[PDB]
């Protein structure tokens, strides 16, 4: 509807099926989503993990060059500009095939990249074979009047990763993902916990449908700091649009002890 | 019912109202529970936080001497013996009023204390004024064919505390608690997450009803490693009896990085 009294940030999440190794098609889909999100008055669009090339880690590593990643990145910056909306995307990193990870980046409505992050927790043997894990903590930055951060997919399943973002001041954690296999406890159990245990909002944007030998769950969701869904999708493609409203675990935690016990 | 094929541990949880500063009454209640649990073939009974003196931290600190704590402890060891069942209880620690914390201890069916733990995360100003926080990680020990551990109440709300137990090999985490205020997201959201994110079982034993200026939630529960309740109580007093059946987060986690980011 209309932007409410008492909300100063409206976000959008893209849920859709990508075609493996067809970035012209996948980027066209993000362009359409960015246009529809901007038309609904969203200021930011979050898109799923590796969407541009499809979630096909072994085939990315074998077939997708650094020049082809750079061209998709350049076009995504163009979409943020031409559609006038901040965009979070996830591509392979910019290094060579054997040296790059899986990334997430935030570009503003001018097409400038404000923040970049390399996925720390790679999932399973195919990712671990195709990508190098990140070594840096998630970034946190002011945008639209809140502290935003980025994490990718499996990352958010580790309470430590979200705690790292929140400990640096994050209020809204944006998470491109690619979750298949009817893993209902991730959105159902883990994500609400991450939100509650840190007093933060998390946005989780998944693929859906048949893609790269898997069938993705959909279930994209924005979870508020009480653990409740501010909005959620089912299994079908969709554009989720949400207005964010305007125990103190982060202070009580004995971090110095905890760091020695992990 | 009968002990099932495929289960070699049956546990019991006591949910009840304590009377503040009346350990003869409160220990009589634990004695009754221990008798009923043992009659149902349970090998261990878990009881709630500070049950013996009631959950009244400021009044414990002001009125309950080290000799009176020691006498209750001695009697609880007697109950484990006389009723022939392992018992987990939670009392003030054995030091002076100004030096003690909140503890949990496990005694075997012979009345010998196998493990002791001092609550690390104290909750709110009254606890923090009445008790000294623990400084040690949770203990983990073989008993009944599994690795058992202990945590207390608020502790379990910190993913780091349960991760510490699981990283030392815990399979079943036993948690005396005192949760009031209709805090449904603790049993509803956090506990299932703790179980899933570590692949462990957690038993959570609460007070219920009117006690010490609060009304306790009940909602005692045993949560399995899929995050599902193996058994649970509502708001009324009860004895919950459960048979325990016979992503690899603990291996994937980049603990060395995580320890620097908390
Ligand atoms: N792209 C990913 O990180 C997939 C995460 C799957 C995690 C899970 N728990 O099944
Ligand atoms: N005895 C306790 O540790 C009370 C925990 C209350 C925690 C909560 N989240 O409200």
Q: What is the DSSP string of A145-206?
A: TEEEEE--GGGGGSHHHHHHHHHTT-SEEEEE---BS--THIIIIIHHHHHHHHT-EEEEE-
Instruction: Give the number of the atom of ligand 2 that is nearest the alpha carbon of residue B121.
Output: 3
A49 lines ligand 1 (CB under 6 A): yes
**Cα within 13 Å of Cα(B45), Cβ side:** 31
The 10 Å Cβ neighbour count of residue A81 is 16
8 A C-beta contact, residue B7 and residue B42:
no
8 A C-beta contact, residue B235 and residue B219:
yes
Nearest one of A129, A130, A170, A131 to A151, comparing CA atoms: A170
Q: Among A160, A165, A184, A226, which would you mutate to test the B interface (most chain B Cβ atoms within 10 Å of its Cβ)?
A: A160
8 A C-beta contact, residue A106 and residue A87:
yes
Q: How far apart are CA A140 and CA A148, in angstroms?
A: 6
Listed resolution, Å: 1.9
Total beta-carbon pairs less than 8 A apart between chain A and chain B: 120
Q: How far apart are CA B48 and CA B181, in angstroms?
A: 16
Q: How far apart are CA B25 and CA A22, in angstroms?
A: 72
Q: Are strands A86-89 and A103-107 parallel, antiparallel or unpaired?
A: antiparallel
The 10 Å Cβ neighbour count of residue A97 is 16
> Closest ligand to A204 CA?
1
**Cα within 13 Å of Cα(B204), Cβ side:** 34
What's the residue count for chain A? Answer: 262
The 10 Å Cβ neighbour count of residue B93 is 20
**What does R_g of chain B's alpha carbons equal in angstroms?**
17
Interchain proximity A262–B261, CB inside 8 Å: no
Indicate the helix (H) or strand (E) that contains B30: helix B23-39
Instruction: Give the number of the atom of ligand 2 that is nearest the alpha carbon of residue B177.
Output: 1
Residues of B in contact with A127 (CB under 8 A): none
- Collapse the DSSP code of B89 into the 3-class scheme (helix H, G, I; strand E, B; otherwise coil) and give the result: strand
Q: What angle do CA B223, B55, B82 make, to 5 degrees?
A: 70
Interchain proximity A164–B255, CB inside 8 Å: no
Lookup: tokens for B5: 């094929």
Lookup: tokens for A6: 């008492």
Indicate the helix (H) or strand (E) that contains B149: strand B146-150
Sheet with B7-15, side-by-side order of all strands = B113-118, B103-107, B86-89, B44-46, B7-15, B238-245
Q: Detail the DSSP E strand segments found in B16-55.
A: 44-46
For ligand 1, atom 9, which residue shows the shortest CA distance?
B247
For ligand 1, atom 5, which residue shows the shortest CA distance?
A154
- CB burial string B168-207: b at 16+ within 10 A, e below: eebbbbbbbbbbbeeeebbbbbbbbbbbbbbebbbbbbbb
Q: What angle do CA B230, B183, B201 make, to 5 degrees?
A: 25
Please give the method by which this entry was determined: X-ray
Measuring CA to CA, how many Å separate A119 from each of A44, A100, A127, A139? Answer: 21, 10, 11, 12
Lookup: tokens for A138: 């998630």
In this complex, the residue of A196, A249, A262 whose CB is nearest that of residue B163 is A262
Lookup: tokens for B85: 């069942």
> Across-strand partners of B116?
B105
- What are the sequence ranges of the domains in chain A? 1-262
Nearest one of B79, B62, B66, B80 to B24, comparing CA atoms: B79
Residues of B in contact with A226 (CB under 8 A): 185
Lookup: tokens for A154: 């499996």
The 10 Å Cβ neighbour count of residue A181 is 10
Q: How far apart are CA A96 and CA A71, in angstroms?
A: 14
The class level of CATH for B1-262 reads alpha beta
Instruction: Give the number of the atom of ligand 1 that is nearest the alpha carbon of residue A183.
Output: 10
Residue of B119, B157, B176, B208 with the most ligand 2 atoms within 8 Å of its CB, for mutation = B157
Interchain proximity B258–A262, CB inside 8 Å: yes
- Collapse the DSSP code of A252 into the 3-class scheme (helix H, G, I; strand E, B; otherwise coil) and give the result: helix
Hunting for tokens 């009345």 — which residue is that?
B111
B190 lines ligand 2 (CB under 6 A): no
Nearest one of B139, B259, B147, B138 to A137, comparing CA atoms: B259
Query: Residue A225: closest CA among chain B residues belongs to which residue?
Result: B185
């Amino acid at each position: 509807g209309l932007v409410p009294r008492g909300s100063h940030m409206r976000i959008a999440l893209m849920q859709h099926t990508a075609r493996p190794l067809d970035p012209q098609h996948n980027l066209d889909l993000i362009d359409d989503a960015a246009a529809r999100a901007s038309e609904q008055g969203a200021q930011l669009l979050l898109t799923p993990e590796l969407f541009g090339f499809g979630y096909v880690p072994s085939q990315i590593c074998a077939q997708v060059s650094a020049e082809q990643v750079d061209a998709a990145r350049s076009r995504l910056r163009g979409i943020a500009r031409d559609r006038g909306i901040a965009l979070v995307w996830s591509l392979p990193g910019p290094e060579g095939p054997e040296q790059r990870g899986i990334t997430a980046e935030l570009a503003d409505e001018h097409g400038e990249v404000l923040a970049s992050y390399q996925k720390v927790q790679l999932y399973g043997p195919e990712e671990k074979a195709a990508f190098v894990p990140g070594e840096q903590p998630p970034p946190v930055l002011s945008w639209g009047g809140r502290q935003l951060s980025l994490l990718v997919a499996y990352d958010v399943e580790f309470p430590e990763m979200v705690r790292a973002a929140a400990a640096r001041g994050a209020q809204l954690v944006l998470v491109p993902t690619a979750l298949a296999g009817d893993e209902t406890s991730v959105p159902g159990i883990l994500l609400p916990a991450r939100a509650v245990e840190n007093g933060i909002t998390l946005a989780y944007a998944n693929h859906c449908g048949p893609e790269g030998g898997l069938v993705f769950d959909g279930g994209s969701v924005v979870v508020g700091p009480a653990g409740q869904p501010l909005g959620e999708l089912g299994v079908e493609p969709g554009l989720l649009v949400v207005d964010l409203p305007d125990a103190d675990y982060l202070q009580d935690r004995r971090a110095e002890l905890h760091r020695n016990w992990l």
